[PDB]
Amino acid sequence: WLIKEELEEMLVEKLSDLDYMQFIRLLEKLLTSQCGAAEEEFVQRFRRSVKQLIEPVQYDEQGMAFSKSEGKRKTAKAEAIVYKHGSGRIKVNGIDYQLYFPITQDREQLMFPFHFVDRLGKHDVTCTVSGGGRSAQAGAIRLAMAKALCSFVTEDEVEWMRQAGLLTTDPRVRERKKPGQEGARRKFTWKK
Amino acid sequence: TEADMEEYIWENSSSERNILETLLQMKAAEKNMEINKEELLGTKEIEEYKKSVVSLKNEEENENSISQYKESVKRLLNVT
Amino acid sequence: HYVDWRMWRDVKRRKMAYEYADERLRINSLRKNTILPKILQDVADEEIAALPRDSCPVRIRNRCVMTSRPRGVKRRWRLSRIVFRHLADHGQLSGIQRATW
Amino acid sequence: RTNENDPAKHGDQHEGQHYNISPQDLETVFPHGLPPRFVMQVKTFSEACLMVRKPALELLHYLKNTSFAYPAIRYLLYGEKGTGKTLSLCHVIHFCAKQDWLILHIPDAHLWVKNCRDLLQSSYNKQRFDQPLEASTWLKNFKTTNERFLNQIKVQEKYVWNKRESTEKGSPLGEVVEQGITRVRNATDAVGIVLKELKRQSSLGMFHLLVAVDGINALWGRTTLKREDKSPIAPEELALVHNLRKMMKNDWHGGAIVSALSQTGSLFKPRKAYLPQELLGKEGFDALDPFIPILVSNYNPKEFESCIQYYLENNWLQHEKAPTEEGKKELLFLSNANPSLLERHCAYL
Amino acid sequence: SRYSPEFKDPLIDKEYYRKPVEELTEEEKYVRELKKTQLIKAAPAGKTSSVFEDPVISKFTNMMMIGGNKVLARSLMIQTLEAVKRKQFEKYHAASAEEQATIERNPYTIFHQALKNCEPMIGLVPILKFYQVPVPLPDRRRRFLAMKWMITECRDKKHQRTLMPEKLSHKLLEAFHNQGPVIKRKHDLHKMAEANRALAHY
RNA sequence: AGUAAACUGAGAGUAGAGUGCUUAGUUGAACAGGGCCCUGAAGCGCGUACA
Numbered sequence A: 001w002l003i004k005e006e007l008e009e010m011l012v013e014k015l016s017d018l019d020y021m022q023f024i025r026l027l028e029k030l031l032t033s034q035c036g037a038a039e040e041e042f043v044q045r046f047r048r049s050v051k052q053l054i055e056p057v058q059y060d061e062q063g064m065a066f067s068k069s070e071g072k073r074k075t076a077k078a079e080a081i082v083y084k085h086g087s088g089r090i091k092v093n094g095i096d097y098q099l100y101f102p103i104t105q106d107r108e109q110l111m112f113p114f115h116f117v118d119r120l121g122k123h124d125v126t127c128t129v130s131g132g133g134r135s136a137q138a139g140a141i142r143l144a145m146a147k148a149l150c151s152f153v154t155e156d157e158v159e160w161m162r163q164a165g166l167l168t169t170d171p172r173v174r175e176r177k178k179p180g181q182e183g184a185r186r187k188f189t190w191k192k
Numbered sequence B: 001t002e003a004d005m006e007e008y009i010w011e012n013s014s015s016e017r018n019i020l021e022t023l024l025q026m027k028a029a030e031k032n033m034e035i036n037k038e039e040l041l042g043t044k045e046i047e048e049y050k051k052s053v054v055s056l057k058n059e060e061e062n063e064n065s066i067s068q069y070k071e072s073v074k075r076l077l078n079v080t
Numbered sequence C: 001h002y003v004d005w006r007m008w009r010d011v012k013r014r015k016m017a018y019e020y021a022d023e024r025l026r027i028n029s030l031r032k033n034t035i036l037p038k039i040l041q042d043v044a045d046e047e048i049a050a051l052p053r054d055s056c057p058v059r060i061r062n063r064c065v066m067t068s069r070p071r072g073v074k075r076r077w078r079l080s081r082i083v084f085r086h087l088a089d090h091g092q093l094s095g096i097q098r099a100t101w
Numbered sequence D: 001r002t003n004e005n006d007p008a009k010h011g012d013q014h015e016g017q018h019y020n021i022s023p024q025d026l027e028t029v030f031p032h033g034l035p036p037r038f039v040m041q042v043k044t045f046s047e048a049c050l051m052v053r054k055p056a057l058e059l060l061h062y063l064k065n066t067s068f069a070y071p072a073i074r075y076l077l078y079g080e081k082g083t084g085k086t087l088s089l090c091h092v093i094h095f096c097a098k099q100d101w102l103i104l105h106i107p108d109a110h111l112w113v114k115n116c117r118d119l120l121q122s123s124y125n126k127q128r129f130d131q132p133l134e135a136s137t138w139l140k141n142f143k144t145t146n147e148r149f150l151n152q153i154k155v156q157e158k159y160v161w162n163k164r165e166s167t168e169k170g171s172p173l174g175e176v177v178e179q180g181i182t183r184v185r186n187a188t189d190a191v192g193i194v195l196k197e198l199k200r201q202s203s204l205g206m207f208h209l210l211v212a213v214d215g216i217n218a219l220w221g222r223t224t225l226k227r228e229d230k231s232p233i234a235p236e237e238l239a240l241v242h243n244l245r246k247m248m249k250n251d252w253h254g255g256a257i258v259s260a261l262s263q264t265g266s267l268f269k270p271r272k273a274y275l276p277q278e279l280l281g282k283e284g285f286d287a288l289d290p291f292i293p294i295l296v297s298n299y300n301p302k303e304f305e306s307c308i309q310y311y312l313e314n315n316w317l318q319h320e321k322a323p324t325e326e327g328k329k330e331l332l333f334l335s336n337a338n339p340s341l342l343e344r345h346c347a348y349l
Numbered sequence E: 001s002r003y004s005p006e007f008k009d010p011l012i013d014k015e016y017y018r019k020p021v022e023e024l025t026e027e028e029k030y031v032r033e034l035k036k037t038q039l040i041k042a043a044p045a046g047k048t049s050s051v052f053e054d055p056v057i058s059k060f061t062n063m064m065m066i067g068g069n070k071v072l073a074r075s076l077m078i079q080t081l082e083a084v085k086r087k088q089f090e091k092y093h094a095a096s097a098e099e100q101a102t103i104e105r106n107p108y109t110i111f112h113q114a115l116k117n118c119e120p121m122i123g124l125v126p127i128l129k130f131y132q133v134p135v136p137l138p139d140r141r142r143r144f145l146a147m148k149w150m151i152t153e154c155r156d157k158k159h160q161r162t163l164m165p166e167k168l169s170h171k172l173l174e175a176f177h178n179q180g181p182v183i184k185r186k187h188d189l190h191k192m193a194e195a196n197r198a199l200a201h202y
Numbered sequence F: 001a002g003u004a005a006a007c008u009g010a011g012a013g014u015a016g017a018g019u020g021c022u023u024a025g026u027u028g029a030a031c032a033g034g035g036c037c038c039u040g041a042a043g044c045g046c047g048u049a050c051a
């Protein structure tokens, strides 16, 4: 249903909570009363409705197919090109992934999407990352790789990844320090 | 001084001296005294070796450069 | 007709320092070096000491121009924090909005 | 796994298969040097099994084709971290020892150029510095490896240890080694004397020498040791380092100088320095060149399977999915066929 | 939390996604359909789909963490596992055939059995009527108490210069065999509960 | 909850001057369930009493 403010704007009138409840309950009864098309059309005037984009598969000069995508985490940005076919090589900033990320946690982050879709060793990846710390860079590269792999994995696989969280951009970012308190929430030691 | 040149020069260089010394040692062991500095340096093998060494010293060092250098050194040392 | 006698003293100090700057500069250059005789640097020291105390740039304070407040003056505007807040909240300062990010 | 245990007959035919070192040979020939983690593995398994590989076979063929008449030739095993250069050098050391060589083996030069609490001034040369502890350690290791040749080899000079104490020409090298060990003060001097005598007697052909130096890049690099005035010390001031450079020279004949670069523990070198020039530096490159560079890299799939099957048979991979091909593929993913990464994962896998 | 209340925690379990439709109940079908519309939080960096994932061990690592050195925490945990396995291997090799059967060698099995042995059945809370009263413990509290007790016992200064991996391995084996100061601590808690039995009506 | 914690930078002001202040970033968790004697906020209300 449209919210009470929506209904108030529709009726250019000022209602109350109980008025909205009465209207909504009457509408619900109208639904339950086998509302036909002639009535469902009127009802839908008060209803309110509540997928990852598949990037094009481009081709190189040699005709090898690939998909390019991008993603940002904290302050890091990553552009990932994933090839339709590959032996699992993942070169980051022209560097091998294991060398560039000396932390097995970051390696696991890189592996997460391809492991999830069971496509490890089936794609060669080139990831250019910039900015932020090591974990932010790992997250950005993971997001970019997942998005690029979407184009190559089936739609059901894409939906599964999105449900898992691979394909959802992280909204968690550092919260700015506030004046008069040490941290974003750390209130200075309460004097007495 | 050699520490005042951006470009390595194979001529009058440590590598050139050392490779010449190695060739002289090998030929002395072979006992055939048909050898000279010019004779040794005129062969295409030393040309390839100096080319590869100059590449490694000046240009960016990579696997292709190292492989070419290894090939040259092997052909020079008669080891395959 | 300055704001207060302290601001007037500061203005006097500024004028005196500006007038005697070059002499102070050269005498200080002489004094601060390890080349000339120690006796030369000592005579320079007594000369610099004999120069008027108020001429010393250290004795110049950055009081607020509009209220002569001796502390909490922004060097970019030369105004005390109170006056700066007043003007900014009245919008008389171009390009200065309030604080939200 | 291979039935062949002699280190002179095995060749490419045995590639991709483990080669066992008996405990007695491990004790005698390899009382040191071997990587700490492989030492832990050997302790766990009671089996010192090194898979033969093209690098080691190549250097063995090199040493079989070497003519001791030639001035001793230099070989340099170079590569990334954990590629098995150390174990290839140990394999060839075993070969030469079984071939009755005298193995002048340096377990690691990085140790010699850092964290030296005992840093006195060399009496033989007041301008250098001694490392009595490390000198005694290496002297003991060398005695363990070549006690048989120790007595058989005589000295050829007079060596004064004190104003009244000395060793005389014709004495066995055992006397010098014993002096160096027991009198630790004379340890570095005895090391130098041993190096000199072994060099000259290899020239004379009393035996065949294999100068097997691990992490050779340290010699011609930098040092962190500080003088009593906190001044830095350059490598040449360390009698051990200068003598080792003298040995790295090829002027002598009667053997071969094998070396293996190693970034592990290197000083002031970025983690990714793994190329011969990047490691040795100008001085090291100039000293070693001429040299035969031999690359050591990750495992191939065949040697990867050999290592995994070895661990499976040994049951080290006590987790359930280790024998599974999926687990094998995950191990290959994580270690990119890197022996050290693979083992450092299998340890807790 | 920057996540709005609409966001739901992600579910990471391959089997849950591979389960056939037919085996699903109507309620499960409805739940699966509903989840298609909800918002899912981005996965935490800690847990994944690896078959070698142990939430208990991850929690113990997090508890053992100090100041955010998760790397060192994980290192210590894996080192303890390896040490326990090594000790079990030595015992197995030194044991006859019959005793080899009874000898365990799985570090995770020893770990979990030892923690179960160190879980306290009951714990004493202050009740007001304040009186320390024997009161049942929830399972979460029991597990948390076991983990904290093990970590504290390993952090006791009585161990002089001993490294955390060796200390934890020894304590884990002692608890696995139902011995050690952690078992003594659980017994002391139970004895206090028994003695304060009379005060339970409070 | 990118919160605590830890760490590292930068800015304000002076000629100079803080372990102070402001601010940027990095790694980054644990509990979140019980009750009301203690604090305070309410309703159910009770009883005091003077303006």
Ligand SMILES: Nc1ncnc2c1ncn2[C@@H]1O[C@H](COP(=O)(O)OP(=O)(O)OP(=O)(O)O)[C@@H](O)[C@H]1O
Pocket (backbone or CB within 6 Å): D035, D037, D038, D041, D049, D050, D051, D052, D053, D080, D081, D082, D083, D084, D085, D086, D087, D088, D262, D263, D264, D338, D339, D340, D341, D343
């Ligand atoms: N031929 C081999 N046989 C058996 N194990 C091997 C072999 N080669 C490598 N490994 C395994 O690889 C592990 C890693 O090797 P290690 O790092 O010690 O060698 P390295 O080349 O000297 O490298 P680093 O630079 O790390 O010192 C060794 O512990 C050993 O377990």
Ligand SMILES: Nc1nc2c(ncn2[C@@H]2O[C@H](COP(=O)(O)OP(=O)(O)O)[C@@H](O)[C@H]2O)c(=O)[nH]1
Pocket (backbone or CB within 6 Å): D124, D158, D159, D160, D161, D188, D189, D190, D191, D192, D193, D196, D239, D243
């Ligand atoms: N104590 C002692 N050491 C010696 C003697 N002779 C040689 N050495 C050691 O052997 C090493 C090699 O000697 P050598 O190369 O001939 O001396 P150098 O050429 O002047 O550096 C030296 O570093 C000495 O420490 C000796 O008579 N006494």
Ligand SMILES: [Mg+2]
Pocket (backbone or CB within 6 Å): D035, D082, D083, D084, D085, D086, D087, D088
């Ligand atoms: Mg090695």
